[PDB]
Amino acid sequence: KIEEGKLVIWINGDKGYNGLAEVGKKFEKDTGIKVTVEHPDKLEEKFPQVAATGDGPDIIFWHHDHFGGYAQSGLLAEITPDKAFQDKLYPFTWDAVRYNGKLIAYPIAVMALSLIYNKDLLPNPPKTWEEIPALDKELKAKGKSALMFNLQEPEFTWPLIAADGGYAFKYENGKYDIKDVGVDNAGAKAGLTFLVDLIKNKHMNADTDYSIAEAAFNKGETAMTINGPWAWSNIDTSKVNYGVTVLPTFKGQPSKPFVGVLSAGINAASPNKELAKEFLENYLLTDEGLEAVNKDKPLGAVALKSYEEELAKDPRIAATMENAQKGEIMPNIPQMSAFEYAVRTAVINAASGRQTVDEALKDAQTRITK
Ligand SMILES: [Zn+2]
Ligand SMILES: [Zn+2]
Numbered sequence: 001k002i003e004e005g006k007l008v009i010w011i012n013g014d015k016g017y018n019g020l021a022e023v024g025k026k027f028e029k030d031t032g033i034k035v036t037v038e039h040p041d042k043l044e045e046k047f048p049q050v051a052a053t054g055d056g057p058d059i060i061f062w063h064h065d066h067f068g069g070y071a072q073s074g075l076l077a078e079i080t081p082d083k084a085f086q087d088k089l090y091p092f093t094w095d096a097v098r099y100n101g102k103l104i105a106y107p108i109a110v111m112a113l114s115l116i117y118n119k120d121l122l123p124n125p126p127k128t129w130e131e132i133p134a135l136d137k138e139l140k141a142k143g144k145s146a147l148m149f150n151l152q153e154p155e156f157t158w159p160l161i162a163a164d165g166g167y168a169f170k171y172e173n174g175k176y177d178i179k180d181v182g183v184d185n186a187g188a189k190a191g192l193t194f195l196v197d198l199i200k201n202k203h204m205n206a207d208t209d210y211s212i213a214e215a216a217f218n219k220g221e222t223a224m225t226i227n228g229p230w231a232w233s234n235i236d237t238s239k240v241n242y243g244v245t246v247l248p249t250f251k252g253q254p255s256k257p258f259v260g261v262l263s264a265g266i267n268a269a270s271p272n273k274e275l276a277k278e279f280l281e282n283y284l285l286t287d288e289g290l291e292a293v294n295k296d297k298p299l300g301a302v303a304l305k306s307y308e309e310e311l312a313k314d315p316r317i318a319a320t321m322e323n324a325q326k327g328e329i330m331p332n333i334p335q336m337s338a339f340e341y342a343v344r345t346a347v348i349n350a351a352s353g354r355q356t357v358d359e360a361l362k363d364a365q366t367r368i369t370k
C-alpha cells in the first residue's frame with residue numbers, strides 16, 4: 001500500500017518533472033512532507049495495475065481523456081476545489097476533468113493545434129480556408145506551396161470538418177450523448193468536401209503525413225502547416241522564421257481542434273488526499289509553481305488564468321489558447337475509440353476517391369452510433 005506522511009507523484013518523464021520536484025522541495029520545506037517524483041516507463045499503463053492493489057503514486061499526471069477510464073474504475077478520488085479556487089482556472093478546463101458529474105482531477109496545461117506559418121513567405125497569414133486555393137496558385141508560381149499538414153489522422157483533419165457543424169458527441173449538462181454523433185451532418189459534409197476539393201485541385205496531396213508535412217515546412221518548401229506546441233522545437237532548429245496563429249475559419253466560422261488537457265489526479269487509495277490537495281492547489285497551481293514546471297519543459301498554454309496571461313505574452317502560446325477555446329474538448333468516453341477509427345477511414349476513403357464524401361461520413365456515423 002501507499003505510505004502515509006509523504007507524497008509520490010507520477011508524470012511522463014519527458015514533461016517538466018524536474019519542475020514538479022522543485023515545487024515538491026518547496027513543499028517539503030514548508031510542511032516537512034517529502035515529495036518524490038517518478039517517471040516509470042509506460043506509467044499510464046502501470047497506474048491501473050498498482051492502483052488496483054492499493055499501491056502506486058499519490059498523484060498522477062496525464063491527459064484528461066484517459067482519466068475517464070480511470071474514473072470508471074474508481075481509481076481516482078473526487079476532488080473538491082471550492083468555488084474560489086475553481087475561478088482561478090479557465091471554465092472550459094474543468095469540463096475536461098469532470099466524469100459523471102464529478103470532478104476527478106486538476107487541469108494543468110492545455111494543448112491544441114494552431115496554424116504555423118513561414119513569416120518570410122507570408123508576413124501576414126490567411127485568416128480563411130477559402131483563400132488556400134488562390135494562395136497556393138500564387139505561391140506555386142514561386143516554386144512554393146501554400147499548405148501541408150498531416151491528413152492521415154482525425155486530430156489534424158477534424159478542425160476543418162467540425163468548423164461548419166461537425167462534432168464527435170453532443171455535450172450537454174456535463175454529459176456526452178453517445179447516440180448523438182455529428183459526423184454525417186451538413187456541417188461535417190461541407191468541411192470534408194472542402195478538404196477533398198483541395199486535394200482534387202492539387203493544393204494538397206492525399207498521402208501527406210506528419211513527417212512529410214514537417215519536413216516540407218521546416219525546409220521552407222511550404223508556407224504553412226498545422227501542428228501543436230510539441231513541434232516548435234524542431235522548427236527552432238531549422239531556423240525557419242515562423243509564427244503561430246489562430247487556425248483559418250471556414251464559412252466564417254472558426255476551425256475547431258480537439259483540446260487535450262494535462263491533468264493531475266489523486267489516487268483513490270491514497271492515505272494522503274489532504275496533503276495531495278494542498279500541494280496541487282496551494283503549491284503547483286500557482287504562478288511560481290507552473291513557472292518552475294514550464295521552465296523545465298514548456299507546458300504550452302495553462303489552465304491557471306493568472307499565469308496563462310503571463311505566458312500569453314508569447315504569441316505562440318496566445319494562439320494555442322485561442323484555438324483551444326474555440327475548439328472541442330477531447331471526449332473522455334470509451335466511444336471516442338470508434339470515432340477515431342471511423343473518421344480516420346472516412347477521411348482517407350474520401351481523399352482517395354474510394355468513397356464519396358457523403359458515403360464515407362455516412363458509414364462512419366453508422367459505425368460510431370452502433
Ligand atoms: Zn507499501
Ligand atoms: Zn522515466
Ligand SMILES: [Zn+2]
Pocket residue numbers: 063065066
Ligand atoms: Zn492522451
Ligand SMILES: [Zn+2]
Pocket residue numbers: 063
Ligand atoms: Zn502529453
